[PDB]
Amino acid sequence: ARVKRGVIARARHKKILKQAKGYYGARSRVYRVAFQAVIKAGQYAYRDRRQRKRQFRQLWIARINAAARQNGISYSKFINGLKKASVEIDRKILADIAVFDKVAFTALVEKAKAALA
Amino acid sequence: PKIKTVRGAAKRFKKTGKGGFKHKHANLRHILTKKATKRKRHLRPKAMVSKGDLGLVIACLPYA
Amino acid sequence: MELVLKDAQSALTVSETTFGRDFNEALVHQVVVAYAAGARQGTRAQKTRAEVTGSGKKPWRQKGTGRARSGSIKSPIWRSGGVTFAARPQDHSQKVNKKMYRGALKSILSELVRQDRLIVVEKFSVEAPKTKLLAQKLKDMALEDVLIITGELDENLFLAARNLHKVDVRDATGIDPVSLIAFDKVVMTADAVKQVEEMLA
Amino acid sequence: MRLNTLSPAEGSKKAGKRLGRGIGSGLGKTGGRGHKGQKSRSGGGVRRGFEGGQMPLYRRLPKFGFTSRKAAITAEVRLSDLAKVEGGVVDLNTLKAANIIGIQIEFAKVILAGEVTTPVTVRGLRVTKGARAAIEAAGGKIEE
RNA sequence: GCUUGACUGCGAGCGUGACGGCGCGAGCAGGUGCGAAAGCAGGUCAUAGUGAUCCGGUGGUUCUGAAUGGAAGGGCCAUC
RNA sequence: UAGCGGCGAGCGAACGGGGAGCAGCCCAGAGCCUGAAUCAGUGUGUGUGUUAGUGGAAGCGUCUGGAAAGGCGCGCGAUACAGGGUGACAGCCCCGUACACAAAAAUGCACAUGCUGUGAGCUCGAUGAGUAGGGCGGGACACGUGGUAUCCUGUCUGAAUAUGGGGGGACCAUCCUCCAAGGCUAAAUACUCCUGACUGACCGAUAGUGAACCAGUACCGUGAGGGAAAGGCGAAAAGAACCCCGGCGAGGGGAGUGAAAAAGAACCUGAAACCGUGUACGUACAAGCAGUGGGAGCACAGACUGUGUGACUGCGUACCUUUUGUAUAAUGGGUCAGCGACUUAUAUUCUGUAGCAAGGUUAACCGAAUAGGGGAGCCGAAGGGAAACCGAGUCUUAACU
Numbered sequence A: 001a002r003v004k005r006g007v008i009a010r011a012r013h014k015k016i017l018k019q020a021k022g023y024y025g026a027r028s029r030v031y032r033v034a035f036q037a038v039i040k041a042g043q044y045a046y047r048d049r050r051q052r053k054r055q056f057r058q059l060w061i062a063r064i065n066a067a068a069r070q071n072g073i074s075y076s077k078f079i080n081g082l083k084k085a086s087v088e089i090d091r092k093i094l095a096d097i098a099v100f101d102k103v104a105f106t107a108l109v110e111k112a113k114a115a116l117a
Numbered sequence B: 001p002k003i004k005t006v007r008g009a010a011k012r013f014k015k016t017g018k019g020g021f022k023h024k025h026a027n028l029r030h031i032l033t034k035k036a037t038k039r040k041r042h043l044r045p046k047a048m049v050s051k052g053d054l055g056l057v058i059a060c061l062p063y064a
Numbered sequence C: 001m002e003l004v005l006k007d008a009q010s011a012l013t014v015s016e017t018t019f020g021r022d023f024n025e026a027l028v029h030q031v032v033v034a035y036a037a038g039a040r041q042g043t044r045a046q047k048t049r050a051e052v053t054g055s056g057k058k059p060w061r062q063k064g065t066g067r068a069r070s071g072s073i074k075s076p077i078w079r080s081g082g083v084t085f086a087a088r089p090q091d092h093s094q095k096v097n098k099k100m101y102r103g104a105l106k107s108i109l110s111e112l113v114r115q116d117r118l119i120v121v122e123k124f125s126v127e128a129p130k131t132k133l134l135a136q137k138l139k140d141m142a143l144e145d146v147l148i149i150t151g152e153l154d155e156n157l158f159l160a161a162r163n164l165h166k167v168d169v170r171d172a173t174g175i176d177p178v179s180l181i182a183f184d185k186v187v188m189t190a191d192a193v194k195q196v197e198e199m200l201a
Numbered sequence D: 001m002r003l004n005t006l007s008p009a010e011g012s013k014k015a016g017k018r019l020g021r022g023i024g025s026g027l028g029k030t031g032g033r034g035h036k037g038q039k040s041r042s043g044g045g046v047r048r049g050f051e052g053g054q055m056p057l058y059r060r061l062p063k064f065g066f067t068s069r070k071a072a073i074t075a076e077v078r079l080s081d082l083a084k085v086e087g088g089v090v091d092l093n094t095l096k097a098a099n100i101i102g103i104q105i106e107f108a109k110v111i112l113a114g115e116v117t118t119p120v121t122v123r124g125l126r127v128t129k130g131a132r133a134a135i136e137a138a139g140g141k142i143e144e
Numbered sequence E: 001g002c003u004u005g006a007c008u009g010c011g012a013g014c015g016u017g018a019c020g021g022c023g024c025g026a027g028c029a030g031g032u033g034c035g036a037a038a039g040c041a042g043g044u045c046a047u048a049g050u051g052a053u054c055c056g057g058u059g060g061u062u063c064u065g066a067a068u069g070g071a072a073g074g075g076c077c078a079u080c
Numbered sequence F: 001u002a003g004c005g006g007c008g009a010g011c012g013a014a015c016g017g018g019g020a021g022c023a024g025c026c027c028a029g030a031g032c033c034u035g036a037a038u039c040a041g042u043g044u045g046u047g048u049g050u051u052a053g054u055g056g057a058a059g060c061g062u063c064u065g066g067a068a069a070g071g072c073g074c075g076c077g078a079u080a081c082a083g084g085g086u087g088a089c090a091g092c093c094c095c096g097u098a099c100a101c102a103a104a105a106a107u108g109c110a111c112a113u114g115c116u117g118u119g120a121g122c123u124c125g126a127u128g129a130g131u132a133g134g135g136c137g138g139g140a141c142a143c144g145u146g147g148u149a150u151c152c153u154g155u156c157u158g159a160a161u162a163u164g165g166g167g168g169g170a171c172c173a174u175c176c177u178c179c180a181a182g183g184c185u186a187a188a189u190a191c192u193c194c195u196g197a198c199u200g201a202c203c204g205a206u207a208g209u210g211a212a213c214c215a216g217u218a219c220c221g222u223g224a225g226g227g228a229a230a231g232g233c234g235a236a237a238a239g240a241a242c243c244c245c246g247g248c249g250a251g252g253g254g255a256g257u258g259a260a261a262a263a264g265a266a267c268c269u270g271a272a273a274c275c276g277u278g279u280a281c282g283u284a285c286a287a288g289c290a291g292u293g294g295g296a297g298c299a300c301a302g303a304c305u306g307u308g309u310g311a312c313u314g315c316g317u318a319c320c321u322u323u324u325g326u327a328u329a330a331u332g333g334g335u336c337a338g339c340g341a342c343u344u345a346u347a348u349u350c351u352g353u354a355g356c357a358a359g360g361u362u363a364a365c366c367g368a369a370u371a372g373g374g375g376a377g378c379c380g381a382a383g384g385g386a387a388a389c390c391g392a393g394u395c396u397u398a399a400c401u
C-alpha cells in the first residue's frame, strides 16, 4: 500500500502559492516563504477587520469636528447637545451629512446648540 | 510472547476476593528485642496493599 | 416457516429460527468482513535497514566535515535505504465464533426469503453436461445471476455451470455468507434447503 | 443486503491514533510525549516496579509462605456439578468423565454452592456440612 | 514498704505519612502485682538513643514432607 | 505454573493430556534342521510419470474514428468467459485454455520375474570391568553448590555381576519399576543454490533486488573490500528524398512521412525551482519582516461591476526549535521536486461493539476445506489460611464482645 504523495503535495503547495500571488520575490515564488507570508497576511487581516472599525470611527469624528467648528461648536459639545436633544444619528451618518449637505448639518448643529442651552 | 511475572512480587503478594493484594508487614524480621511488643503484634497480621502502590503491584503481577 | 416452491407450487416447512429470524446487520457485517480478511493471502516484504544490501561502515567521520551526522548508508532517511517499518508476510485471518457465524448465516437466509431472492425448487438437474442447456434452463427460469445450491453433487450441472460467470453451482455443505449476499438470486433444491436446515439447526 | 449496503454498529470501529501528523490532528509534533525526557525517547521508560531507585515495594516487603503441592491436586465441586454428572454416583472417575474436575485431581470437596434437586450418591469425597445437609434434603446419600 | 504490668492474645476509634511505615488508644479475654477499697499498672514527664529486604544462625511447632514411612529442606511463631 | 536467581535483572521445566507418524531388529554362539522369511545389487516384462510434441469450438453488419476490439443491430460456441497479443476495451482475428491424444531413445517410481550374495525356525546357552560407584576440578540438566538427586569426564581410585545391579530429586528402610558399561533402524521434522506451474488488498524506475539498462559493471582502494548512475518516438521507421542559410560544419527553415513531429531520436506526459521576450500599471526627495486596512489614478473586459497595477496613508520587528523569557546579535533551513519518523508480532489489562450466557470458547490437528469435526485445555460461577484443612464462611487466639 505504497501511497505516493506527489499529486496531493503539489496541489497543496499550489493552493498556498496562488494565495500568495502578488508578493515580492520569493514570497510569491518559493513555497516556504510564500506560506509564511500567507499566514502572516491572514493574521493581519483579522487584526485589521478590528482596526478598520476603529479607523473609520476616528475619521468620522475628525470630519464632524471640522464641520461643527465651522458652525461654531466643538465636537464634544456638539455630541453632548445631540445626546441631550435625543438625536440618535450615528456619526458615520453625521460625517456623511457634513460632507454632502451643509444645510442639514447646520440644522443639526442648531438643534444641538438649542438643546445644550 | 507471554508476559513474564516478577517472581519476587509473586512471592511477596497474594490476590484477595475482590482483587486487592494482602502482604506481610516489613520490620518483623530482625532486631526485635528493642521493638515494643504492641508494635510487633500489630505488624504480625497480613495487610492490604494501599491505593498508591496498587498499580505498581498490578504491573508486576499480570497473571495474578 | 413455510416456503412455497416454484416448480410444484407446493409448500415446504422450515425452521423459524433458521429462515425467519431478524437481520442482525452488525453481526452479518462482521462475518462478511472476516471472510474477506481470511480470503486475502498477505505475501509481501520490504527490507529493513538491516536487510538492505550494503556495508555497515560509517559514511563519514562523526565530526569535522560539517555534513550532517550519518551512521549507516542503509538509513531509512537515505535514498536506497531500508524501509523504516518494513513489512513481513502476515496472517490476516480473523477468528469467528461458531455461533456468530451460524447466526450470520441464519440472518442472511432470512433476508433472502424476505426479499424474494431465495427460490426453492424440487430439482435443478440438467440432462447433459452442456453450458448451452444450462443457459437455456436459466432463461426459462427467468434467471441470470444466480447461486444454484444443490444437495447431492452433480457432475453435469457443475460442468455446465463452469463457463457461466454469473452462475455458480455449490454443494449445500459449501455455502458461504459472502457468496449468498453477492449472487443476485439463490436457487436451492428441496434437498439442499433441508440439508441447510439440518446443518444450521 | 448487498456487499455495499452493510455497515458496522455505531461505536464498533474507532479511529486509530496516528501520532505526529501536524497541528490540527491534536497529536502533533511531539506525539503526546511531552518534552525531552527519558519517557520521551524511543524505547524510553523504566521497567515494572522501578521507583527512581528507591527500594521497590516488591523488595521492601518480606517474602512469605510456601506453595502446597497437594493444593494443586485438590478440587472443589458444586451441587450444580452433582447434577452435571450422569448417573447417580459421584466418584472421582465419574466427575472426571463429566469434565468437572481435572485429570490429575486426587481429592475433591462438595461445597454448598448452587443447589442439588435430584438424589445423588456422593462416594469417597469430602462434603461440607451445608452440602451434606443439602444432599440429604435432596434425598441423596454420602458414603466413604 | 511490697513487687515484675519492662504481661500474652486482641482492639472501637483517631493522628501522621506518596508509600514502606510510625504514633495515641478506651475497652474485651486470660493470668498477675500493689491497695482496706475506689482504683492504678501493656515500662520510664513527653519528644532523640536508629536500619527495609535478601541470605543465613538458634529454639519451639497440632503445617508441609516429590512412590510409601520417616528424614532433609521449606513454612509458621520467637529471636540473632 | 513448579522451581532457579547479587531470590536482582532475568532464566524457566517436568508429570499428565490432545494430535502427526507409528517398526522393530541384530551381535557378544553353538548343536540341529538348513539356500527357509528379509535386505541389497543385477538382467527381463508390465504400468505410470519426466525429458520433444498433435488436434482443439464459434461473428458479421453499421456509426464515430488514423486505426475498432468501442457505440448500435442482429447471430453463434462454451467440460473452452485462465491468460496474452493484434492500430482504443475481442468468448467467436491470432497464440492459447477446457478436453482428448503422443515417444524411436534415455531415464524416475511401482509391481512381476530371473540370477547372485544374504541368511529364517527349534533347543540349549551366554547377557558388554578399568565399567558402575567414589575423592578432587569443571561442565550439562529450568536447577547459579545449595539440603541437590540425575548425566558427561581432566585427575586419582574402583565393585557386584540376576542368590546380582540401576532409578524413583539429600539420605535410610520397604515397595514398585527397569537391566548400563555393543550396535542398526523408515515415517511424521528442518531447509531451498536450483527446475516447473500458479497466486498476491506486494513494488512500479529516488520504489522493487545493489542491478528492469552489457551490474557486482563503471569508478574507488596495495589489498580484504566498497560500489553507482542510467527504462518509455511511433500502431508501423513510414527515422525526415529534395531545396535553402551555414565551414562539403553544428544548428536551423521549408518539403515529405505520420493521427500527432510544440511525437524528430537532447524523442509519451512534461510540474516546480531557475532564466528570458512581449504587453498593462507602478517606480529616480525616498528610510525598516515588504504585508494588511483604507485608497486615488491608469489600463483592460464586458454593461456600473469584474480583472490588473497600487501613488498616498493607519497598523505592523519572519518561521521552527529550545526556553522564565527570543525581532533577537541563540539553533536549523540557498530554493524546488521526490523520499523521510509512533510500526509489526505475541501476551496482558480497560473501553466500545457483536454473539451466546451460569456458562463462554476451542488449540494443534482431521477435513468433498474460511464449512463440519476436535472441548485437550482456558476463563468464570467461592472464598479464607503460610499450610494441613475448613467452606458462605474462614483465619487469628485458649476463646473472641
Ligand SMILES: [Mg+2]
Pocket (backbone or CB within 6 Å): B028, B029
Ligand atoms: Mg523470623
Ligand SMILES: [Mg+2]
Pocket (backbone or CB within 6 Å): none
Ligand atoms: Mg569496524
Ligand SMILES: [Mg+2]
Pocket (backbone or CB within 6 Å): C047, C052, C080, C081, C082, C083
Ligand atoms: Mg530499497
Ligand SMILES: [Mg+2]
Pocket (backbone or CB within 6 Å): none
Ligand atoms: Mg472450525
Ligand SMILES: [Mg+2]
Pocket (backbone or CB within 6 Å): D025, D026, D027
Ligand atoms: Mg490533543
Ligand SMILES: [Mg+2]
Pocket (backbone or CB within 6 Å): D026
Ligand atoms: Mg494539544
Ligand SMILES: [Mg+2]
Pocket (backbone or CB within 6 Å): D031, D032, D033, D034
Ligand atoms: Mg502521552
Ligand SMILES: [Mg+2]
Pocket (backbone or CB within 6 Å): D036
Ligand atoms: Mg524536541
Ligand SMILES: [Mg+2]
Pocket (backbone or CB within 6 Å): D035, D036
Ligand atoms: Mg525539561
Ligand SMILES: [Mg+2]
Pocket (backbone or CB within 6 Å): D033, D034, D035, D036, D037, D038, D039, D040
Ligand atoms: Mg517527560
Ligand SMILES: [Mg+2]
Pocket (backbone or CB within 6 Å): D042, D043
Ligand atoms: Mg533506539
Ligand SMILES: [Mg+2]
Pocket (backbone or CB within 6 Å): D099, D101, D102, D103
Ligand atoms: Mg477436561
Ligand SMILES: [Mg+2]
Pocket (backbone or CB within 6 Å): none
Ligand atoms: Mg489485696
Ligand SMILES: [Mg+2]
Pocket (backbone or CB within 6 Å): none
Ligand atoms: Mg525522659
Ligand SMILES: [Mg+2]
Pocket (backbone or CB within 6 Å): E053, E054
Ligand atoms: Mg536483596
Ligand SMILES: [Mg+2]
Pocket (backbone or CB within 6 Å): E055
Ligand atoms: Mg546469596
